[PDB]
């Protein structure tokens, strides 16, 4: 590529795997979203929460793709494996799975940043730090806040607590 | 001081101790605030309540400092001892500690007013009455109102009650 | 903590010491401020300069505290030792002490950034770089500019020079 | 008087003497003002400063007079003795004489407040505290600030310092 400069094949490859990870997460959140829209789940607030994240993750992947093209790398796409579950249980169950998924994106982000550090690629490190590392941190903190409130609520009557959380927080 | 008039050394000294008391209270409220912002406490309303008071107390100290300079006294600052606790328990626990702290500022205010009375210092008495005595009374009354509601709520299920209070009152 | 990830105990501890350093600096600047408001000092411009910095440092500490909570660390507070002086001399003396204090915050900032580098904590490094390292650099440069002007002014008649600097620069 | 209640003859008499004191001060400030408007003094800023105070003192006397009528007392007027000087020297000399005059009004205010205290007249005490005691304190503090700046300025060349103070402070 006539424009490629200081952009290692390892980082190119890792950016592609991260793209697949973000599309995978987008897909999980779309499935989380429409599950809470089922007439027998019916928590419209939990649905909007996860459907917004589906959009967030999709834009994350698109951003990585644009950066890949900006550095002269080649986008390569792979199969997107389906979400890990077909039914997601309670809001509590869903929030736990969401935070597990976000911690796995964060670790991959951190792993990619460390690779850019080893490759002396400061543009990649700055790219990850501006548009990803901090947004992951804020988001995992919100999910943690939500978990604490769902748990304090689903004490003696989980039913009431799930309704109240959806109504008054989400 | 060329401007000092009817301003006793005892009142000067007491105004300085009150300044330290107000900064101390500001500090306690900052610690109360960030405790309720912990991902494992996660009561954003309780956090905003105490962080606003941290600002209130800080401005109280600044006001006493400006008055000290207006009377020709000399501001002298001392160490600020850390808050009395590192974790503050429940909203109920926090509200109880807040009201204990406000009653101690009120008593110091009242003690200083009585000193100004003994020193025949009407400007100090008017200064305390306009900007402090009544704001303490309103604030202790709110904290009392909040305590009554937290207690009526944290009956059979404290968890639900703490969430509802944070959501619907704060 | 359910959200803690790639956040070492050493950085947690250092963030807490930095919080104490920023509150300490806030306190120094509050004392610098009210000293220049004394009827026998009476340099209202020098007072506004240092009182704005007291606010700046206080918000710096609050920002570190919010970041501590975002990473799953625990805020721990310590005594705040009083400012190093009770009277601050001339504007020149005050500006010199201010720049010594800012260089000490800068060094602690730099020391913490190096720790995050050693701990491979890129979110901390980005956090310090966005909200602290550059603002310290701009501020020390202003204080340096002010020092140069105060010194060029307090030549044959320091009295006139101190008044002119306060009137025409601050 | 059909409306007089809890208003002692001693306070009535003292309010009348205070009225004479405030008109006397108004008169002094009018003379200070027009002195600095002389073509051979020519400090228009010092003139505006003292002429505004002439207005302030005149309104102070009018306020005491209205309060006297509100309590059922009888306003009695006496000769107004001329200002203590015909020429007022430098701005420094004038500021010193102004602060001496304001301290004498403050003491009379304080003396009258103590009389109202002895007479158990809380309306008089509140009247003095709302409209007089604090405005005296702020004003003596400004005059003190001005004195400090005039003195720091009239060091090696009083001429330049007097011009600069008038131009850049007043």
- Cα separation, A80 vs A46, in Å, equals 24
How far is B109 from B114, CA to CA, in rounded Å?
9
**Residues C80, B79 contacting (CB under 8 angstroms):** yes
How close A156 comes to chain B (CA, Å)? 7
Exposure string of D39-49, with b = 16+ CB inside 10 Å and e = fewer, is eebebeebbeb
Count of CB atoms within 10 A of residue A5's CB? 9
Q: Say how far residue C38 (Cα) sits from the centre of its chain.
A: 23
Per DSSP, helices labelled H in B37-90 are: 44-70
CA-to-CA distance for C159 and A64, rounded, in angstroms? 61
The alpha-helical segments, DSSP class H, found in C86-133 are 91-118, 122-128
Could you tell me which residues of chain A have a Cβ less than 8 Å from any Cβ in chain C? Answer: 99, 103, 106-107, 110, 113-114, 117, 125, 128-130, 133-134, 137-138, 140-141, 143-144, 147
For B77, the 3-state DSSP assignment is coil
How far CA B3 is from CA of B58, C155, D100, in Å, comes to 27, 30, 10
- Read off the tokens for C135: 């603002």
User: Taking CB atoms and an 8 Å cutoff, what residues of chain D touch B69?
Assistant: 141
Closest CA to C123 of B75, D123, D169, A139: A139
The Cα A167–Cα A42 span in angstroms is 12
Partners of C80 in the β-ladder: B80
Cα pseudo-dihedral A84, A90, A96, A100, rounded to 10: 10
* DSSP H stretches of helix in A71-90: none
Give me the helix-helix angle, D9-36 and D44-70, nearest 10°. Answer: 160
> Under a CB-based contact definition with an 8 Å cutoff, are residues B104 and C100 in contact?
no
Cα gap D103→C102, rounded to integer Å: 42
Set of chain A residues whose Cβ sits within 8 Å of the Cβ of C8? none
Pair C106, C136: CB distance under 8 Å: yes
- 3-state SS track over chain B: CCCCCCCCHHHHHHHHHHHHHHHHHHHHHHHHHHHHCCCCCCCHHHHHHHHHHHHHHHHHHHHHHHHHHHCCCCCCCCCECCCCCCCCCCHHHHHHHHHHHHHHHHHHHHHHHHHHHHCCCHHHHHHHHHHHHHHHHHHHHHHHHHHHHHHHHCCCCHHHHHHHHHHHCC
* 3-state secondary structure at position B80: strand
The whole-angstrom distance between A118's CA and the closest CA on chain C is: 11
Separation of alpha carbons B91 and A28, rounded Å = 36
Taking alpha carbons only, the member of D107, D57, D76 closest to residue D9 is: D76
Distance CA B115, CA C1 (A): 50
Distance of CA D33 to the CA centre of its chain: 14
Chain B residues inside the 8 Å CB shell of C83: 77
Domains belonging to chain A, first-starting first, are: 9-169 (1.20.1260.10)
Q: What DSSP character marks residue C169?
A: T
d(CA C50, CA C61): 17
Cα–Cα distance between C97 and C150 in angstroms, integer? 14
Rounded CA-CA distance A78/A16 in Å is 9
d(CA B25, CA B19): 10
User: Residue A39 carries which DSSP code?
Assistant: T
Nearest C-alpha neighbor of C18 from the set C70, C83, C62? C62
**What residues does B80 pair with on adjacent strands?**
C80
Instruction: Select from C100, C71, C64, C106 the least CA-distant residue to C83.
Output: C100
Using the beta-carbon criterion (under 8 Å), do A149 and B42 form an inter-chain contact? yes
* Best residue in C66, C68, C123 for a mutation probing chain A (most A CBs within 10 Å): C123
Rounded Cα distance, B76 and B16, in Å? 6
Length of chain A: 170
Technique employed here was X-ray
Q: In a 3-state reduction of DSSP, which class is residue A121?
A: coil
- Burial C23-43, CB ≥16 within 10 A → b, else e: bbbbbbbbbbbbbbbbbebbb
Helix (H, G, I), strand (E, B) or coil at D83: coil
């Amino acid at each position: 590529s006539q424009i490629r400069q200081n952009y290692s094949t390892e980082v190119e490859a890792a950016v592609n795997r991260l793209v697949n990870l973000y599309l995978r997460a987008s897909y999980t959140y779309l499935s989380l979203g429409f599950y809470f829209d089922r007439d027998d789940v019916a928590l419209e607030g939990v649905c909007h929460f996860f459907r917004e994240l589906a959009e967030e993750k999709r834009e994350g992947a698109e951003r990585l793709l644009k950066m890949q093209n900006q550095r002269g790398g080649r986008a390569l796409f792979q199969d997107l494996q389906k979400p890990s579950q077909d039914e997601w249980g309670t809001t509590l169950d869903a929030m736990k799975a969401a935070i597990v998924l976000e911690k796995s994106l964060n670790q991959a982000l951190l792993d990619l940043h460390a690779l850019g550090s080893a490759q002396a690629d400061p543009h990649l490190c700055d790219f990850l730090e501006s548009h990803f590392l901090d947004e992951e941190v804020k988001l995992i903190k919100k999910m943690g806040d939500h978990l604490t409130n769902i748990q304090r609520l689903v004490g003696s009557q989980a039913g009431l607590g799930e309704y109240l959380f959806e109504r008054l927080t989400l």
